[PDB]
Write a protein that binds this ligand. Structure first.
Ligand SMILES: [Zn+2]
Length: 86
């Protein structure tokens, strides 16, 4: 679904935020997404999962200044994962 910012706006933001801050956000997204993959198809959400989720949300807001939402986060993830290698 359409995101709160355009695709072009999101690209241009990621041409402005520093590479080190982008990498920070990539790593916290990567850690969350990996844990989500382990728990996606089974009951419950572990305390570890919740901890990683909360970290990701906090880093998202710190690095981007954008109120967290799942769709704009996805669009940012796709851009970050294209650039960075865990
Ligand atoms: Zn689950």
């Amino acid at each position: 679904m359409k995101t709160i910012f355009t695709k072009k706006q999101t690209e241009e933001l990621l041409n402005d935020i520093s590479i080190e801050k982008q990498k920070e956000l990539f790593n916290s997204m990567h850690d969350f997404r990996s844990q989500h993959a382990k728990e996606a198809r089974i009951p419950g959400w572990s305390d570890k999962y919740n901890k990683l989720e909360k970290k990701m949300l906090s880093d998202f807001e710190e690095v981007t200044g954008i109120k967290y939402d799942t769709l704009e986060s996805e669009l940012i993830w796709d851009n970050l994962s294209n650039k960075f290698l865990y």
